[PDB]
A paper describes a structure:
To assess whether removal of the H-bonding interaction between Glu16 and the chromophore would result in improved maturation to the red chromophore in mPlum, we prepared the point mutant mPlum-E16P and measured its absorption spectrum. This single amino acid change resulted in an RFP that matures almost exclusively to the red chromophore. mPlum-E16P emits red fluorescence at 630 nm, which is almost 20 nm blue-shifted relative to mPlum. Notably, the quantum yield of mPlum-E16P is 40% higher than the quantum yield of mPlum and its extinction coefficient of 29,350±2,000 M–1 cm–1 is similar to that of mPlum (22,000 M–1 cm–1), resulting in a brighter RFP. Conversely, the structure of mPlum-E16P presents no appreciable omit map electron density for the green chromophore when contoured at 3σ. Only density corresponding to a planar sp2-hybridized C-alpha carbon at residue 66, indicating the red chromophore, is apparent. On the acylimine side of the chromophore, the Pro16 residue in mPlum-E16P appears to slightly distort the secondary structure of the first β-strand in the protein, but does not cause any major structural changes. In mPlum-E16P, the Lys70 side chain adopts a conformation similar to that found in the fast and efficient maturing RFP mCherry. In contrast, the side-chain amino groups of Lys70 in mPlum-E16P and mPlum are able to sit about 4 Å and 5 Å away, respectively, from the nearest red chromophore heavy atom (O2, the imidazolinone oxygen). On the other hand, if formation of the blue species is faster than the dehydration step, the final ratio of red/green chromophores should increase. This is what we observe for our mPlum variant with the most efficient red chromophore maturation, mPlum-E16P, whose 410 nm peak maximum is reached 1.8 h before its green chromophore maturation half-time.
Numbering used by the authors: 7 to 65, 69 to 222
Amino acid sequence: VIKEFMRFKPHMEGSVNGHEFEIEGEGEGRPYEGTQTARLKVTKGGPLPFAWDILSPQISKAYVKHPADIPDYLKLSFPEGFKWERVMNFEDGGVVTVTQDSSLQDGEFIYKVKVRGTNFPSDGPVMQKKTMGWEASSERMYPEDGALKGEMKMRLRLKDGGHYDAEVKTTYMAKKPVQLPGAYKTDIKLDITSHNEDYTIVEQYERAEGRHS
Ligand code: NA
């Protein structure tokens, strides 16, 4: 049911510092190669008064290259799919939580994402839009409590040349108890490849590949 080429349709809504928004789009990729692109648009609440970069990672784990000897739990979960929940704790007190449903419907993945951000400083780089994309990350993946967990520190580049850090924890839960893997690592790099001035129209690319740790 997962072909070498698969499209996906994300819908994301929520709020950051009280600012509500909705976003839609369409993407495509090669799940076994760990590669994908997407076209996103802000359909409600645009232009966003905060950095697009905090939303970009809440937008696809069926697209991670896995070696044969590591069970690809999240691909295996299809077609029913899986859900995931995330917390990002930013270094200046900003927090984002996320809940997400992923399913496979009529040959395309469907993503429903709910995002809540709060406690970002008004003069911080998120609310002032001083960010410039994520450095590559490595997510530590491990089974726990009958779910698949991921842990990573993520690094946002700043316009001034510094960095702005987040500690991130995600739980990924298949809708059926397909095979959990052992502990491993996933290397991920997300790039913003195009955007309009005020980021109401955005394109992104991500590559992700699991490996033994
Ligand atoms: Na390692």
